[PDB]
Amino acid sequence: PVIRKFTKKNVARAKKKYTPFSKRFKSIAAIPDLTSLPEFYGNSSELMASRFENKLKTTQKHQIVETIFSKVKKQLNSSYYLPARENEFASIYLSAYSAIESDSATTIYVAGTPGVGKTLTVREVVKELLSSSAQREIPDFLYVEINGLKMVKPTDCYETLWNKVSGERLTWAASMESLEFYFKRVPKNKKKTIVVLLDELDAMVTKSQDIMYNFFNWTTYENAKLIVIAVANTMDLPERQLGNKITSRIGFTRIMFTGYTHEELKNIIDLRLKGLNDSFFYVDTKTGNAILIDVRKVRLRMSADAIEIASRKVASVSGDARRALKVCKRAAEIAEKHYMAKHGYGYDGVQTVHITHVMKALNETLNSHVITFMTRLSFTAKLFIYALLNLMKKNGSQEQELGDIVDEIKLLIEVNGSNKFVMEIAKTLFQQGSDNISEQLRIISWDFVLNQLLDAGILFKQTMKNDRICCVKLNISVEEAKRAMNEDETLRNL
Amino acid sequence: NLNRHIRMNFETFRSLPTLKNSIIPLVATSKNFGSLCTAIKSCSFLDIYNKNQLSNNLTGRLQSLSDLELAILISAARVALRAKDGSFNFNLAYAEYEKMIKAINS
Amino acid sequence: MNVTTPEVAFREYQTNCLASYISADPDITPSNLILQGYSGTGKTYTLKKYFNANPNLHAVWLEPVELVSWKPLLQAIARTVQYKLKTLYPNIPTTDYDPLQVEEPFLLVKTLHNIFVQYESLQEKTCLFLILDGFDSLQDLDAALFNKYIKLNELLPKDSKINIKFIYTMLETSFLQRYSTHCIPTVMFPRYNVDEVSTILVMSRCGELMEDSCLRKRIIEEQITDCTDDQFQNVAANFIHLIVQAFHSYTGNDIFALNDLIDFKWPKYVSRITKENIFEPLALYKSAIKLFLSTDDNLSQTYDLSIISKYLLIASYICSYLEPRYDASIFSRKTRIIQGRAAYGRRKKKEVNPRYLQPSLFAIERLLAIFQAIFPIQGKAESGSLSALREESLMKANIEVFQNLSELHTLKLIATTMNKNIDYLSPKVRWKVNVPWEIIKEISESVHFNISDYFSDIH
Numbered sequence A: 001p002v003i004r005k006f007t008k009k010n011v012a013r014a015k016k017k018y019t020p021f022s023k024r025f026k027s028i029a030a031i032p033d034l035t036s037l038p039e040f041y042g043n044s045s046e047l048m049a050s051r052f053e054n055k056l057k058t059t060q061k062h063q064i065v066e067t068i069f070s071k072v073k074k075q076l077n078s079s080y081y082l083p084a085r086e087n088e089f090a091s092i093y094l095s096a097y098s099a100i101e102s103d104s105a106t107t108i109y110v111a112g113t114p115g116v117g118k119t120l121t122v123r124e125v126v127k128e129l130l131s132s133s134a135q136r137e138i139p140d141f142l143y144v145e146i147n148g149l150k151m152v153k154p155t156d157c158y159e160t161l162w163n164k165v166s167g168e169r170l171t172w173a174a175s176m177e178s179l180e181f182y183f184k185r186v187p188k189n190k191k192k193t194i195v196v197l198l199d200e201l202d203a204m205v206t207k208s209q210d211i212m213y214n215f216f217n218w219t220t221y222e223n224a225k226l227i228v229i230a231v232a233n234t235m236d237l238p239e240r241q242l243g244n245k246i247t248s249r250i251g252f253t254r255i256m257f258t259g260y261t262h263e264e265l266k267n268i269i270d271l272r273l274k275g276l277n278d279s280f281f282y283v284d285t286k287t288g289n290a291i292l293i294d295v296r297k298v299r300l301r302m303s304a305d306a307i308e309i310a311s312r313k314v315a316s317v318s319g320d321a322r323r324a325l326k327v328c329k330r331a332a333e334i335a336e337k338h339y340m341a342k343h344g345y346g347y348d349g350v351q352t353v354h355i356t357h358v359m360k361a362l363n364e365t366l367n368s369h370v371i372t373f374m375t376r377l378s379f380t381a382k383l384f385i386y387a388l389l390n391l392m393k394k395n396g397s398q399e400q401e402l403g404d405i406v407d408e409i410k411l412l413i414e415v416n417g418s419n420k421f422v423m424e425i426a427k428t429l430f431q432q433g434s435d436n437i438s439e440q441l442r443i444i445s446w447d448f449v450l451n452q453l454l455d456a457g458i459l460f461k462q463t464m465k466n467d468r469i470c471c472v473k474l475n476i477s478v479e480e481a482k483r484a485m486n487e488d489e490t491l492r493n494l
Numbered sequence B: 001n002l003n004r005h006i007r008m009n010f011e012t013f014r015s016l017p018t019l020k021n022s023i024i025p026l027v028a029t030s031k032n033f034g035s036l037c038t039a040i041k042s043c044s045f046l047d048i049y050n051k052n053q054l055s056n057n058l059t060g061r062l063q064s065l066s067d068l069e070l071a072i073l074i075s076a077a078r079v080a081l082r083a084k085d086g087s088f089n090f091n092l093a094y095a096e097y098e099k100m101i102k103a104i105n106s
Numbered sequence C: 001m002n003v004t005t006p007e008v009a010f011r012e013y014q015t016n017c018l019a020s021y022i023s024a025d026p027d028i029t030p031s032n033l034i035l036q037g038y039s040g041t042g043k044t045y046t047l048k049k050y051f052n053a054n055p056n057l058h059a060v061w062l063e064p065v066e067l068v069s070w071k072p073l074l075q076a077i078a079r080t081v082q083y084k085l086k087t088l089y090p091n092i093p094t095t096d097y098d099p100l101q102v103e104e105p106f107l108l109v110k111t112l113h114n115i116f117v118q119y120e121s122l123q124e125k126t127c128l129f130l131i132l133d134g135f136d137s138l139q140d141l142d143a144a145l146f147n148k149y150i151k152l153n154e155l156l157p158k159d160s161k162i163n164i165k166f167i168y169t170m171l172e173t174s175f176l177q178r179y180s181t182h183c184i185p186t187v188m189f190p191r192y193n194v195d196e197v198s199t200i201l202v203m204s205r206c207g208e209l210m211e212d213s214c215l216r217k218r219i220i221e222e223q224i225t226d227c228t229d230d231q232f233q234n235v236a237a238n239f240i241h242l243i244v245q246a247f248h249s250y251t252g253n254d255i256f257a258l259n260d261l262i263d264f265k266w267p268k269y270v271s272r273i274t275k276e277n278i279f280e281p282l283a284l285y286k287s288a289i290k291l292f293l294s295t296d297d298n299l300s301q302t303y304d305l306s307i308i309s310k311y312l313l314i315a316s317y318i319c320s321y322l323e324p325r326y327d328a329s330i331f332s333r334k335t336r337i338i339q340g341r342a343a344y345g346r347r348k349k350k351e352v353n354p355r356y357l358q359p360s361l362f363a364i365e366r367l368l369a370i371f372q373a374i375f376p377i378q379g380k381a382e383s384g385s386l387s388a389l390r391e392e393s394l395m396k397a398n399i400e401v402f403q404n405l406s407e408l409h410t411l412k413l414i415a416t417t418m419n420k421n422i423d424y425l426s427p428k429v430r431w432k433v434n435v436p437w438e439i440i441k442e443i444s445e446s447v448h449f450n451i452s453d454y455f456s457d458i459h
Ligand SMILES: Nc1ncnc2c1ncn2[C@@H]1O[C@H](COP(=O)(O)OP(=O)(O)OP(=O)(O)O)[C@@H](O)[C@H]1O
Pocket: A077, A078, A079, A080, A081, A082, A084, A085, A112, A113, A114, A115, A116, A117, A118, A119, A120, A121, A200, A268, A321, A322
């Protein structure tokens, strides 16, 4: 008989509990040890780490081709020693080692540009600290990866924390509270040290930082022990979002990683290449498979001076290793494919790459296609932007209507009833040559090209309904617009 | 003719799929072979196409209206010209309209 | 593919276009196509007129004129799709999903994927046709929309025994023009012309009002046995010649409002026609000329109201179309006693007649004053020894005006600064009216007041 006023059936309610742990022992004496526990401290995630391995496996193989450069590409890929950034190693490893010797609640903040080896260097610091756990002389403790960006709702930190320290499922408003219960209310002798590190907080706490406020509020105990870190790019964040009293009372340590020097860059990228540097290969005669120490034995090499210029150009801007390494890989690519194009094998005794093609790879990143495109358009857009600049010359307005520019256009034409190019594009634009066709106030294709440029991004149209008085703006420059303008033989003279 | 329309895309639009759209109906109506021949020779039906294509955008729409609309639109036009922002209202146009008629009948 | 053409009168262009565009085999149909038009052209009439021409092709029909938003379209679609499927494949098994299960196009896509993977086992492939009449005409419409409905053949897997196609219908062309970069097929209908709309109406409404009652009424209200249906259509015809020769000027090339006004004013013309009136329909037209001269299509007195409501409103039109300074000459009657000068009034005429203008503002005290000043005479005196000694025969600030005023803001014939959290009570508030001249005129000669002289002189 009743009717619900609005339905939700595509709901996917999650089976997660509202009773915190605080209400399943009911006294201080009533509690067991988590260390003497099979389900706590994560002895069960491994099965779901291996349950899904087989889902995507095959053994198809037909006429494998394999070539010279690719092995070096994957020598050079980011998925693997480094002595370049080692004083921060010798300092933060010192701090963390002395910290777990102190069993205190210490806190640290680092930032740095994307491409500073921050995640690399840190992941390796703590790998060395894993081997220190394999010393079996330091108290065992446990890592926590925090990729809020690989999380949806930034309160899920607490949820996943509980579902990985316990494997138990709740909502944040039970989990974090049970967790405070887990932290301060719990003594030391059985609670464990855990180490945690936050990644890219610039988007995680965007509203009011009540989450991270809770976090840093957890980081101020003497009965609870933890090892906390975070990552960002900006630096004022601890005092920006909090204010000064909080960030000051906590008294943490601050750092950021910078762009590397060109020499360290080349040192390291070659450090990922010395297994293959200057090496010689046995090489078949049909597929060109480079096989190592109907077959040749040739040498391989790459332009070292090109290493110099390539690292040298991008060490000065940011210091992004990833950029350097992709430049390397793409140079190798153009070398390899030109080589293949030489012989033309199909699809079913020296080899070296040049500073010329290294820079050919490094440069087109900065060489924009927009210019050749805007030069290689039709006449109309060029004409119209030229009229725009004519107006900008007539008034110095920095902005124009539609009606004013269209007036400029018609004037810019009917003045030039004498130039030949405009003589010959004359009748075939309003009614297209023939009779039976009445005139039209505007030209053909003007709406087309308008929207074309709008999609292009150069043109900016405010929100109005009138076709005439709608204000219009250009986005780029007038100089570069002239670097399209006079490139037409007919436009330079008018 | 068809080379000239090739020119047209080369200068008007510089993009193909609109062209394919225009090209389709040519065959799409094509019924026998002598018709195909003569029609793609003259391309006189490109004329019908592109006359009825953007036919009703700005002009033919004003081509089919009463004279009353014209009188009042004039009464709006000349007074917007008299004006700063070109703003206008109902009875204003009615006034200048009747003035026009008084002049005509005078 | 053999397509029977609809041998239509006036759209054999678009007939050619779409009967060429579309046939049973989907391959010779496009992926997405528009049929824009304008109202009255029978674009919607002629689409089904073509489906008459081709029965073995079928289509679904939606009318979001009534829907409001996106999700209700999703729901209606998810309904009609599988409805149509199972209604037309009876033998096929199913697990009919809830259409209300949809709340987002992804969910629509998901459930259609389920529809198809259950309809996997067909003998030949099939494309069907969806119809969204007035997809511009929505009521919370925004601009992030049409591209998405283009992209429905996008995410569908290519191995579909059952596919679909989209159909649209718009008016303005402005928001069409906003999006034609996608190089789309399109077919269109110009607003008709006078012989065209003429013949559309002589072929369309002819049988209707040839077979309405009032004929059969009048023929025997008059009781005249000299008749044939040729002449019935003939007199209807010349009557409509008269209709359109009148009001083509009024409208041009439309049908709907003509049909309305026909229905309304037809019967009075029936009431006039007779034997002489058929033997010579000119004088008949003279005998029914009048509505041609005067549409008059709405419906002595105007109000059954109180008197202050009648007379107070009369004042505010003055206190926002009169200069506050140019009134003290005409709106005074007191005999001066102490020394002091009046002003000169309007030395200069104004040439624009603020009747044409968006009027001004004022505080209320101006009305309190001016209304007392105009007020019809009450408090009748005698010239007696004490009659006028204490009478103070002049209306004063009672409560009744305050409350008969509060009635008016709710009757919305006064306006104020249009406001949520209105407060009638402020020092700062400006007021106004929202009425024309004719409102204030229709009061006057009924109550027998005069103010036309206060306005009739300046321009
Ligand atoms: N000293 C180095 N030794 C070896 N590889 C390096 C070195 N410095 C940078 N790299 C390379 O550059 C990348 C830098 O990674 P980094 O730790 O800076 O990521 P990130 O800055 O945390 O990324 P994001 O800012 O997006 O979180 C590494 O993947 C690594 O391959």
